[PDB]
Structure 1
Amino acid sequence: MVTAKKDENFSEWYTQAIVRSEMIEYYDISGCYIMRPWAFHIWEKVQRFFDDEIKKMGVENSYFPMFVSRHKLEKPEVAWVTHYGDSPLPEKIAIRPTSETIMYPAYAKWIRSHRDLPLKLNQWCSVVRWEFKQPTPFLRTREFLWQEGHTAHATEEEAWELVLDILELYRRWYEECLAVPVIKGEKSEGEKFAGGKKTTTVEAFIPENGRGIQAATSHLLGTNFAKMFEIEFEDEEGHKRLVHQTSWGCTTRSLGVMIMTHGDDKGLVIPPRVASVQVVIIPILFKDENTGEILGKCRELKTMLEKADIRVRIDDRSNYTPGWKYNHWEVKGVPLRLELGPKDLAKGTARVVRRDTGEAYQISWADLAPKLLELMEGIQRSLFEKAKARLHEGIEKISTFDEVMPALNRKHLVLAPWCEDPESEEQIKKETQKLSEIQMTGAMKTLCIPFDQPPMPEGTKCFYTGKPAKRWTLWGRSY
């Protein structure tokens, strides 16, 4: 069970939560962890939703090799294979950190005419970024699972609308499945993906350590990579034009984020929409009191709730006390826990405890399926809405730079008018980092320029340079 406290020592709390809930297991190679079934259930669920939604868009899944030649890569932190067994490769090959240098030549080969567009591929794989720093399970790891999508189109308007559609699917992944609120915005030109035209992004906020984290990203690559890799088509009139590319990505970091958003001092709290066990049925057995009837009814209740597509498990393992089972499913975060013991056998009801709030209900057996649907909807919405309020309580609207340092001290982000000069963002990072040193990184940086822009009074000056401000920008310490 979890001993540490979320608002007192976040780091050890998080470690305990993930470990005690059986989601991860440590490994002798630093930077890689093991994803036990409990976490992978959740992953499977969001992968299913994203997959169905992108298949609805014509995107098709595929698989490109893990390996890229050195020649075709330096056309850093990439991992190099030099030997098989005991013989060295004639050329070292690297392991993929992202798949552009692998797929894009194939794109060059496959695209000749307008009729071959759009071209929309996704792939669900593992990548390797071997930064020699300190990892954070889910959040920052040397190997991780993601999906990545790459499309090429005949026009930039098409590409751009797909960028937006995909980032909307990413908003739904987080807010709608994992109950984590996020912010849609656009990356600064010092933070955007280089040689993309424009990066869009969903951002999240960890209040317990006042930090920003990127959740997913969708790039408008435009035509830079087409020039690079010579991906041309012939339009209707017979002209050779460059294609307009997008790519987009989202990883298991999402599970990390969800743990921090909903976790509490007893452990995990798993939003029902992604819960593999939404309801655990715990038979209360002691002194051979009514065990045959208790199990009879528990299995009947299971078939009842399964008819309503509630995902139900009866914890009838003989070698565990009920109280151990309670703590087990609590630390694990099963949304709803249903207790049936011999005294309920004559009541015709049963006791239901919701994990998020701990409230208890006495519900009839006939009334179980619909009331449990209802509670799960309410848990899902309320997980989300409490999180969304914490998010917006953590953001401060400022006018001048004087307001920054107090705000970061309250573990908050700042929304400020900005002129969007790239060198000013770096001046800002350095200034704030040094001020932080007068007492994990202390520097503050841009997170995104929110799509949702609040009102911009005329003659608003950039909070740092005093120049005329162009857009509100979200800044904060980061992950």
Structure 2
Amino acid sequence: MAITSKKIENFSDWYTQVIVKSELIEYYDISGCYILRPAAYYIWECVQAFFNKEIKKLNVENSYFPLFVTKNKLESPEVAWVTKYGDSNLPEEIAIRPTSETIMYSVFPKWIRSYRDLPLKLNQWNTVVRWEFKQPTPFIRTREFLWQEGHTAHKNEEEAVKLVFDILDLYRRWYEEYLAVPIIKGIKSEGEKFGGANFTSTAEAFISENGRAIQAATSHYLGTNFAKMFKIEFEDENEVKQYVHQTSWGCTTRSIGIMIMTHGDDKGLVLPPNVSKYKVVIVPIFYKTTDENAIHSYCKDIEKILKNAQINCVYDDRASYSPGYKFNHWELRGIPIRIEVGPKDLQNNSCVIVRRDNNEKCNVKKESVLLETQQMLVDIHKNLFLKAKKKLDDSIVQVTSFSEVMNALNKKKMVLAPWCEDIATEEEIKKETQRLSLNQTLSGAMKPLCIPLDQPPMPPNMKCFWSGKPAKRWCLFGRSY
């Protein structure tokens, strides 16, 4: 099979082709739900192992809360409602969790009585259902998805904010160190922040081949807002009752999606080594051999070296298929490294190592196969990240006025604009960009993506690019998913 749509030219078709033909995703007769085949679920398992290791160092503990919330306890136009079991009607409808704030925070008071019960730090690896009737995009925007949601309660605001930003850096490492994707850290505007949050912090990603931003992960400071709604109070060290200061943070399998859209090429899936089940595929070339079993033994001992070094590989000894067919088979599926061994290189005690990301063929003696493999795996990651980073940073153009924006938006860029952050302007900007875009399947609108944590200098009397009023801060704007 082959990718018959160029990514730069027909992005959404390239994407569906890649995710189905690499065996990541299978479509399902309920739209917005997709089957995660082994190759994608493996990526999820990897980032889950990493994130678990890292949040246990923050003393977060894993737990599992129910899938169902009662109607009253959810007081939304996006929720699947259960009503019957078999043919009998439920006494009252129950909702499938779209998020678990109201499921968890209504039992938090049974656990929190005094300052000696804090901080409470829980995490869930679960599934949520968000039944939006807009159009789905696999991984990026789906009605059922896997995620992790963490929730903490602290005795004050300093501890809670510190954790919000510790989690945000763990999300940075999740994307950069495992998915080789660079992200922009920022604060969400108050029109786009989480409902009930004090502030929402965020990591944003950008798909430059189609000009779209994607929110990669979120860490919210809820403050005492949910504490006052659910009366989560505690006796402090002065016998005074106080409200807990709360955080919640989440990340979903959308991350896999962002990864595919960043590194994928026209040959197919390109996988960062850390998240590929097979890091190496060994492909024999049997033509012109003198001892087929010698080629077998040679490949199998390369295999033994690698997995004795904890490097998982597959030996593709299928006899019917040409070497070229197998090269394409494993390239499509994103295996980062291929080892070719033909009769000349058994004669030389060498083998050819091929990097998936640049297709550079390299002749290495077998004596240093492992070392070279390990080095290349590391370098593959570096290069995937670096290529992505420059692509990200060449996608942001600073503008001082709205008149420069549409042009920048039509070259598939993000605008860094000085903004007064007044909430009424978010919708005005969205509709104006929406109407101007209506002149050549997803939305033309431009929205605040985030106020970046790393700020350029604000010149003295800088006017807001939309309002003409004093500009509060620099904000990223762009089309998104």
> Which residues of 2 match residues 63-212 of structure 1 at below 5 A?
63-74=64-75, 76-212=77-213
SS at match of 1:268: coil
Aligned residues: 479
Return the alpha-carbon distance in structure 1 between the equivalents of residues 11 and 139 of structure 2.
15
Residue equivalent to 1:452: 454
* CA positional deviation for 1:169: 0.3
CA distance in 1, matches of 2:149, 2:292: 51
Give the Cα separation in 2 of the matches to 1:14 and 1:223: 42
- Pick aligned residue for 2:476 from 471, 474, 477: 474
The more displaced of 101-110 and 283-292 is: 283-292
- Runs of at least 5 residues in structure 2 that lack an aligned partner in the other structure: none
Output the amino acid matched with 1:141: T
Counterpart contact for 1:179–1:384, Cα < 8 Å: yes
CA distance in 1, matches of 2:339, 2:195: 52
Q: How big is the shift at 1:181?
A: 0.7
> Which residue matches 2:428?
427
TM-score by length of 1: 0.98
Aligned to 1:273: 274
Alignment-mate amino acid for residue 127 of structure 1: V
1:403 Cα offset (Å): 0.4
1:240 maps to a residue whose letter is K
1:184-216 C-alpha deviation (Å, 9 max, x unpaired): 000001111121100000000011110111000
Once the 2 structures are TM-superposed, how far is the Cα of residue 288 of structure 1 from its aligned partner?
A: 6.5
Q: SS at the partner of 1:105?
A: coil
SS at structure 2 position matched to 1:305:
helix
* Equivalent residue, structure 1, for 2:335: 334
User: 1:154-205, CA deviations, whole angstroms, 9 ceiling, x for partnerless residues?
Assistant: 0100000000000000000001110011000000011111211000000000
Amino acid at match of 2:237: E
The code of the aligned residue for 2:30 comes to I
Q: Is the 8 A contact 1:353 1:360 kept in 2?
A: yes
Contact 2:295 2:346 in 1 (8 A): yes
Separation (CA, whole Å) in 1 of partners of 2:288 and 2:126: 51
Structure 1, 241-250 or 369-378: larger mean CA deviation = 369-378
| 2:60 counterpart residue number | 59
User: Alignment partner for residue 441 of structure 1, among 434, 440, 443?
Assistant: 443
Counterparts of 1:259-270 in structure 2 under 5 Å? 259-270=260-271
**1:134 aligned counterpart, secondary structure:** coil
Q: Tell me, in whole angstroms, the C-alpha distance in 1 between the residues paired with 2:73 and 2:420.
A: 38
TM-score (norm 2): 0.98
Aligned partner of residue 425 in structure 1, secondary structure: helix
Displacement of 1:262: 0.3
Look up the equivalent residue of 1:136 and give its one-letter code. Answer: T
How big is the shift at 1:75? 11
Q: Distance in 2 between matches of 1:334 and 1:290?
A: 28
Once residues 41 and 319 of structure 2 are traced to their aligned partners in structure 1, the CA distance between those partners, rounded to angstroms, is 26
Per-residue CA distance 1:426-452 (angstroms, 9 max, x = gap): 211111111112341111110000000
Q: Is the 8 A contact 1:290 1:342 kept in 2?
A: no
What is the distance in 1 between the residues matched to 2:478 and 2:294?
A: 58
Quote the residue 2:37 is aligned against. Answer: 36
Aligned with 2:456: secondary structure?
A: coil
Task: Deviation per CA, 1:123-169: give whole Å up to 9, x if none.
Answer: 00001011122211101111000000000000100000000000000
Q: C-alpha offsets along residues 62-98 of structure 1, whole Å, 9 cap, x if unaligned?
A: 0001011111112911001110000000101110110
Counterpart code for 1:284? I
- Shift, 1:320, TM fit: 3.6
- Residue 457 of structure 1 and its aligned partner are, at CA, apart by 1.4
Letter in 2 for 1:214: Q
Q: For residues 23 and 438 of structure 1, what CA distance do their matches in structure 2 show? A: 35
Q: What SS class does the counterpart of residue 208 from structure 1 fall into?
A: coil
Q: Distance in 2 between matches of 1:441 and 1:105?
A: 37
Q: Deviations over 1:406-442 (max 9, x none)?
A: 1101011000111111112221111111111234111
Between 1:195-204 and 1:426-435, the stretch displaced more is: 426-435
Unpaired stretches in structure 1, ≥5 consecutive residues: none
CA distance in 2, matches of 1:305, 1:433: 53
CA distance in 1 between counterparts of 2:470 and 2:58 reads 41
State the distance in 1 between where 2:70 and 2:175 align.
35
Instruction: Find the residue that maps to 1:201 and give its secondary structure.
Output: strand
Q: Shift of the alpha carbon at 1:110?
A: 0.9
- Higher alpha-carbon deviation: 424-433 or 445-454: 424-433
How many Å apart are 1:14 and its aligned residue?
0.4
Q: CA RMSD in A?
A: 1.2
Structure 1 letter corresponding to 2:457:
P
Displacement of 1:371: 1.2
Tell me which amino acid in the other structure corresponds to 2:327: Y
Please show how residues 322-401 of structure 1 align to structure 2 within 5 Å. Answer: 322-401=323-402
Larger CA deviation: 78-87 vs 294-303: 294-303
Cα pair 2:186 2:201 within 8 Å, conserved: yes
Structure 1 residue 300 displacement after superposition:
1.0
Q: Deviations over 1:294-330 (max 9, x none)?
A: 1111111112122333222212234543322211110
Secondary structure of the structure 2 residue equivalent to 1:449: strand
> Mean Cα displacement is larger for which, 194-203 or 287-296?
287-296
Matches within 5 A, 1:233-248: 233-248=234-249
Distance 1:134 1:89 in 2: 31
114-123 or 422-431, which moves further after superposition? 422-431
Q: 1:303 to 1:88 in 2, by over 3 A?
A: same
Whether the 8 Å CA contact 1:226–1:243 is kept in 2: the answer is yes
2-structure distance, mates of 1:108, 1:96: 20
Q: Between the two proteins, what is the percent identity of the paired residues?
A: 65
CA distance in 1 between counterparts of 2:312 and 2:68 reads 40
- 1:207-246 aligned within 5 A: 207-246=208-247
